[PDB]
Amino acid sequence: QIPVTPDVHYDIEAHYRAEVRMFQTGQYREWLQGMVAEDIHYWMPIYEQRLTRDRRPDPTPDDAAIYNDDFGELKQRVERLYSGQVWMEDPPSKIRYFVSNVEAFEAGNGELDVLSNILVYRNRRQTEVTVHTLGREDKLRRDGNGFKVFRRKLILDARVTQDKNLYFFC
Amino acid sequence: QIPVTPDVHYDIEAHYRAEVRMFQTGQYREWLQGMVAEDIHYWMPIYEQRLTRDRRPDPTPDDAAIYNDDFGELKQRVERLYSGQVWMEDPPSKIRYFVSNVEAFEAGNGELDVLSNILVYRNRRQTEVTVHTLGREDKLRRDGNGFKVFRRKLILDARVTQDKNLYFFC
Amino acid sequence: QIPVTPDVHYDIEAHYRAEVRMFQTGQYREWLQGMVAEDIHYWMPIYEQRLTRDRRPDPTPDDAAIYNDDFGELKQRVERLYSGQVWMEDPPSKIRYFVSNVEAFEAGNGELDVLSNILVYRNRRQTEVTVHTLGREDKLRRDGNGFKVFRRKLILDARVTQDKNLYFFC
Amino acid sequence: TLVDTVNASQSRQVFWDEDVYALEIERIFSRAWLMLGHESLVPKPGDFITTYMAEDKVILSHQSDGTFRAFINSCSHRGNQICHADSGNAKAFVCNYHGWVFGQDGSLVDVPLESRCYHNSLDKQKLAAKSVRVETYKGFIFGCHDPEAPSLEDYLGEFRYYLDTIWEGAGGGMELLGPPMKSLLQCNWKVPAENFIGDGYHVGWTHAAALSQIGGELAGLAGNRADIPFDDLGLQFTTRHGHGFGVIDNAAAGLHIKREGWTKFLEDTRGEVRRKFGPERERLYLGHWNCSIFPNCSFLYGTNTFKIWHPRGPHEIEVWTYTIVPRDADPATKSMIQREAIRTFGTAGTLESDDGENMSSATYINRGVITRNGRMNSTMGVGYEGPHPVYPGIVGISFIGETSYRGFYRFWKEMIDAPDWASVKANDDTWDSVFPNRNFWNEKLN
Amino acid sequence: TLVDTVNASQSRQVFWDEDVYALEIERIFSRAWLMLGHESLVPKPGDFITTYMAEDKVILSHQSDGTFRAFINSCSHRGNQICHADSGNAKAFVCNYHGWVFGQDGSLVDVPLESRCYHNSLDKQKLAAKSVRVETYKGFIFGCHDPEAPSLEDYLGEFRYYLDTIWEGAGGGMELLGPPMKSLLQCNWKVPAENFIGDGYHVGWTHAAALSQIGGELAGLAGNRADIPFDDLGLQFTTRHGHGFGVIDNAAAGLHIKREGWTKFLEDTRGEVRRKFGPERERLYLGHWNCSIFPNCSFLYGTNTFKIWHPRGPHEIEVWTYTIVPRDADPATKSMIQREAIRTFGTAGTLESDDGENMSSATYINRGVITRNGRMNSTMGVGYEGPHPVYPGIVGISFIGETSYRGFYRFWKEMIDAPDWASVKANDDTWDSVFPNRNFWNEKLNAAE
Amino acid sequence: TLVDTVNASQSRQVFWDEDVYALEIERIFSRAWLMLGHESLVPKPGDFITTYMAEDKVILSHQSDGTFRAFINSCSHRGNQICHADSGNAKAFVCNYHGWVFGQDGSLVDVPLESRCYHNSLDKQKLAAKSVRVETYKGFIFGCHDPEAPSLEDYLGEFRYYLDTIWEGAGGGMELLGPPMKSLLQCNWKVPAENFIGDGYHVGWTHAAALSQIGGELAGLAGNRADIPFDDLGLQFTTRHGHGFGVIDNAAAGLHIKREGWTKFLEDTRGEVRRKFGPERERLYLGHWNCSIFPNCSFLYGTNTFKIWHPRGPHEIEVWTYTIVPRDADPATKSMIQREAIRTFGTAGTLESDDGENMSSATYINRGVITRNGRMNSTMGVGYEGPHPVYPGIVGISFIGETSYRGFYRFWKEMIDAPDWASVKANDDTWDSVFPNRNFWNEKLNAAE
Ligand code: FES
Ligand code: FES
Ligand code: FES
Ligand SMILES: [Fe+3]
Ligand SMILES: [Fe+3]
Ligand SMILES: [Fe+3]
């Protein structure tokens, strides 16, 4: 897989910066419409801790996952953070994303394979603070308005989640 | 609402990196002289936790703020760190900044509206560590071939600050 | 004192992103071969807390350091993660790097002086999480269509390390 | 008084106090049967999982001989954790510090340099990793530290009447799908245990948004409006050893959006349940259950999430979430149930995500001295319950009700007061004297 | 002993020990009047704030009827925190676990499904959120958990003589400006309490660089050198219920750089203060105060920062910082006072930022067994203090001294030692025996002029 | 029983229980001599370091007459830590809160405004920072809090026979190089202590990888092969006050890859060691030691890492790691030893990084009540040990054995059971009765040769 040119790199980073702004400002409908393809698979597998001698395969979409969603399932998830009226989210919890190490590769047929590191800082109420780190593996399509994601795989670094929930998008 | 060219974006990123390095190396006088406009308003509001139903307006500069400074007031703050003998800062505490999600927009008259995520890692003495996240909203103007900030609004993520102080610049 | 051009800047960032990828995926041999020069000095000094009035010089390579290695000694370190069943690393622990504020300067003889901020998040077993922040000061030279590091100085922000070990590369 | 069974209230200290917690560890967790997993998690010989019994790490292993055994996951040399893997297949486990080798039942089977350095003087028979008693009920695997405990069969007791409906059902019963989600939640273990055993009340309030979105059957619950005859719509149950649940009739698949296979499965098997277990239990088979098995296992039957609340002191838990599915369901039906159960009740659950603060706030509010010396009320439906002519145990008239809270805290008190199992067993015939309305159902059903 | 009132020392255990802290919660925080806020924070019917009494969360509400009430922020069903808003306007508060509804006084006013599911068989009278006794003084609102406690006015006692100078003043008194800054600090609550009650001594040492930078009146203090006749420059005061403060003469606005409106207001109003309260209290009205109200509220009158030190166990606090301003000041003055007060003493304060290690180190050094079995000294100026012919309580000769430490710890000891309020009241007339120099002020003043 | 010396087992409670830890603080850390450093760390008049004695912070200072003193790093005013610097040179230390000035021995020598504000009435001689007894052995510096403790020489006791081999050696002895690495490790302080005192057994299992890569002498330990006569290859030693070590013959520089200077230094000095101390000690001089000095100091002689395990409660330590080097080695040799020592055993050590989980898991596994009411076995080699005709104390036949564990826990039990030093001393004649095989070495050595 050939690394993208610096100008393509730029556009990919710009796209991810705008995606993060949508998340941070609660513009989830606009994100689904403008940034996510209708054939999306949005996937966060549960990885167990295994001995190195263990030859079992890595998790597939048929196995346990925290997220394993199509476009309609994402639309469903997004609406919770509208309308609430969800009392834990009155007022909305705060979230801030630090995306780093974006590397893209041309994948044929106009598509891109993109890796990135994500740090997510969350605050709510008076003193509640939680932090998550993840890898992201995307496939992006070019379209008439930039890029849309059609496959997103999120790899959590922590086996045991030190938070009340993982109810945020990446 | 016009996003900047890649060449302008690069210059802004370069400006912010140089600003961070001034903060990290204690060159506060250089920062103030070269990177801050004499018409600066430096502002970090106090945001209370309110119910969504609450219809009171957001904080303005007439309300409680942790910072609410003009240039002369920043100069005063600077000199405590730059010249004072403050025993907690013998030797200087350590600070490291991670600036992410820089998005700039051409405003009128050569001015820029610039948005930024900031993660601040602080260490002192033997085992003390504190960590802050915030949003930054700047108005910059070109100061060829660099920039100077003339409005800076800093949005703290945490309601209750888990640190001795917030005596650092962003 | 000459900062690099934007194109050279991009190339240094892309080099660093590839480096990070190699660390995160355990490709240490490939790193040593392709990204590290044979005249490398890889150095992580121990900085003590001293009063400002102290006039003693900064640590040199003849003083205590956590790392103080030539290429052969780096090779030795790299194999511990290969040529050994190390039971703490069965399976390997997870590490994720957030590199920011990369600033590069043309240093003479075609060599580059490069500053960067590093945030390193590590997870292992069920609930273990440790976090490190460092400054990195490199001298790089051009090698083919990329770079190799020939001097790396790592400046830890914490006096007392809050982790079992510092057995990771930067 | 920590629990008042007469007036149905509890001290706030039960969610907060360190000494109360220590007594729980002694008199509940070191005495009771605790959920370890299911045969489906360790299906082949040599298969194991690592898990917890309260704060003790244990290894559960499918033995070469087909039995299931468990042991404390701590080396008999210097104490190190024997195995760190979540799951795998192992003929032996080796401690990583010095290489002592443990068998599938925790026996010390070999030590490096046994002849050379120990001079064959090491008495390996006395150095087994501590065994834990293991018993199975319909494929579900429980452990117990107390050799005086009743059989698992007797600990479930009359609760088996109910569990047989679903864990036998049309004949295939149910199983667990892993790997589990694992998360820390800063609450006492009893807050979620009581929420799942009996908290129909909260559903329409806390989850009003989720129910309005999902639409369909359960949607009516949203807002807890006064005009609905909830008592025409379900029941609540409690038993001698604290186990209980509420049921919403005809709502098993109510929170699933894609449910064709699960809905069809129930349609296809309900007739066999009617035959084997009677119409009274066919009713349950088609209902949605919120259930806790005393002390710290809970599940939703219908939505099909399955949870163990592992205590980490009085103010934290580690929550493990599996999916529970019928064994005889087609693989695709099992996968769809798993996706819907995780989307509603997993770590990013559209419903579960709503509950975190409910649980932690009920706990941590008691940081204040004036606050924790207050009490909590669980009197909802008191007197609208009693022995039933068909259903064993004690039955309340609605899934919105606190019958099962009352049974839970009654048995919690009984256990905390009893110095041993013999004392508990002494009370077997009189346990339900605190439900004074003995003619309620006869008079009501007439 | 924990506190030696004869020789003016304290055990280091008072900053560290868990059982001592537990006795404080029971015998001070569960007993005393604690600062909840001010009418200005809850000014209109229905207006509420959430706050702390020690480690208990409380709601304070301006009732439809114009009175103020408070209650524990914990639902009577399963205990859930009722309200998470910092402030607002509400006729009711709804517990969001199951929807129990609580009135502005904490009454249980609605229970969802009461008929259907409770069968109207819930006694809502026994299920009010727990009430907190509230009384007010000059708009400042306090709470108390002990029904045997004296009135707030008797609890302030002779300290009202001082407070009336500034909380009535020319007629308009003072009020609080929020929202508050909130921050955690890893220290015992008493370290900041004592620092504000009486620590003139640290100012010239710790804040030397801030003082020398500002220049002006207070800048003379920088460095703590012998040059200055400090005692000519101010006084220190302590009272029966531990309340105390230091005053620097004619220095009220000395730390404000932009201070036109504030200085003008003092000049404009000092006359009426002289007429009402006399020359001796006009002196105080123009002075800079560093004050603590026993146990855990503090303020600087002049600089105008106002602090509550909410304990979180013995080795942490949550500090809430408000601004205190005269009600009758112009809005532009009020906003300027707020800016100056926050720039000096807020979370990024140019002075306050100097003190955080002074507070935490004094606490956490006691991790060591040998260390904590030591003691602390507060003997500065002992015997240069006593009852005074004009000013009530006990007066010491300088803002640099420890009269107010001694007063603070004496009362702390009295309360910690007392099984009930009756036993405290039983020593109202002999509290100040530990200050033996009865004719100190007679002799000082006679011999003077 | 917490320690069974008859059957050589211990309760897991010793790694976990908070009340056991409190007893250790009282009966071990406040009783014994603890390692502070070495003259080389404070080599000139005025030089100082900050360090710990268990959880107490101390200052160690080289006085003007070349003696050393130490004192608790806490101000006698309000308790503030006096000095925050790791090291430096100071004729006085000034507390940052109010500026009280402490001398090199912790005496309170000056206070700001002593005349003006204290009226010269502060009794400064009663307000010294608390002294700690300081004694030195061959340049190594120890402290003790217990007035009744025996001399440092008597506490080392028969262990000095061993230490003189290397801390005198050919005449130059050894010194420490700093600054130290400092890290937190979530383990009980005893797990590393025992690991270093006697755990030859883990080396070939845990460090097999590191060993295979280094090659040479110690590489043959990898995988712990049953065909090797380990007892031909070393010995293990324990002594009356808990100190012990294992020795691997002829392997001093075995983990060093660049070792020309160190290997030549040993070759050039062994002759004089044989002369002074006998071939029995020349053997030790050329060997690799793993050593603990009771309670919480450990070192590897040969690899030359030197560790102090400072407790932070029963479930945490702060590890300080120095390099130990011969004084008479060339500067180039000392530098090379430090690089090799750090590369194997520092915070990023190629060996040390393997051991963290072994330390922490043995501790935290005891979070579970059923687990912590279990026991730990240390029976390896029992009965293959006894008094020796040449070597003092109790000697075991292999560096792979638990002789030194048994000695360590025997002394721990003795200290914990003893209300004072007088009770300990009363066991001096019968301390080793728990090693029943009294004729083991006489039969063995006679059947040999
Ligand atoms: S601790 Fe398990 S083999 Fe030694
Ligand atoms: S906990 Fe408040 S309504 Fe149930
Ligand atoms: S605390 Fe040290 S001088 Fe006051
Ligand atoms: Fe729920
Ligand atoms: Fe101060
Ligand atoms: Fe080791």
Residue numbers in the entry:
A (entry chain D), B (entry chain F), C (entry chain B): 5 to 174
D (entry chain C): 6 to 451
E (entry chain E), F (entry chain A): 6 to 454
Sentences from the paper on this structure:
The initial step involved in oxidative hydroxylation of monoaromatic and polyaromatic compounds by the microorganism Sphingobium yanoikuyae strain B1 (B1), previously known as Sphingomonas yanoikuyae strain B1 and Beijerinckia sp. strain B1, is performed by a set of multiple terminal Rieske non-heme iron oxygenases. These enzymes share a single electron donor system consisting of a reductase and a ferredoxin (BPDO-FB1). One of the terminal Rieske oxygenases, biphenyl 2,3-dioxygenase (BPDO-OB1), is responsible for B1's ability to dihydroxylate large aromatic compounds, such as chrysene and benzo[a]pyrene. Rieske oxygenase systems have multiple components whose function is to transfer electrons from NAD(P)H to active molecular oxygen and ultimately oxidize aromatic hydrocarbon substrates.
The asymmetric unit contains the entire BPDO-OB1α3β3 hexamer and residues 6 – 454 of the α subunits and residues 5 – 174 of the β subunits were modeled into the electron density. The structure has been refined to a resolution of 1.7 Å with a final Rfactor of 18.8 % and an Rfree of 22.9 %. The three copies of the α and β subunits form an α3β3 quaternary structure similar to the quaternary structure observed in all known RO structures. The hexamer forms a mushroom-shaped structure, illustrated in Figure 1, where the three α subunits form the cap and the three β subunits form the stem. The loop region located at the entrance of the α subunit active site is disordered, with higher than average B-factors and low side-chain electron density. The mononuclear iron is coordinated by two histidines, His-207 and His-212, and one aspartate, Asp-360, at the rear of the active site. In BPDO-OB1, a clear bimodal electron density distribution was not observed, but instead an egg-shaped electron density above the mononuclear iron was present. Residual positive electron density was not observed on the Fo-Fc electron density maps when modeling molecular oxygen as the fourth iron ligand; however, refinement with relaxed restraints (refinement restraints allowing the oxygen-oxygen bond an RMSD of 0.3Å) placed the oxygen-oxygen bond distance at 0.8 – 1.1Å in the three subunits. The final model has both molecular oxygen and water bound to the iron in partially occupied states. The BPDO-OB1 crystals were grown in atmospheric conditions, therefore molecular oxygen or water could constitute the fourth ligand on the mononuclear iron.
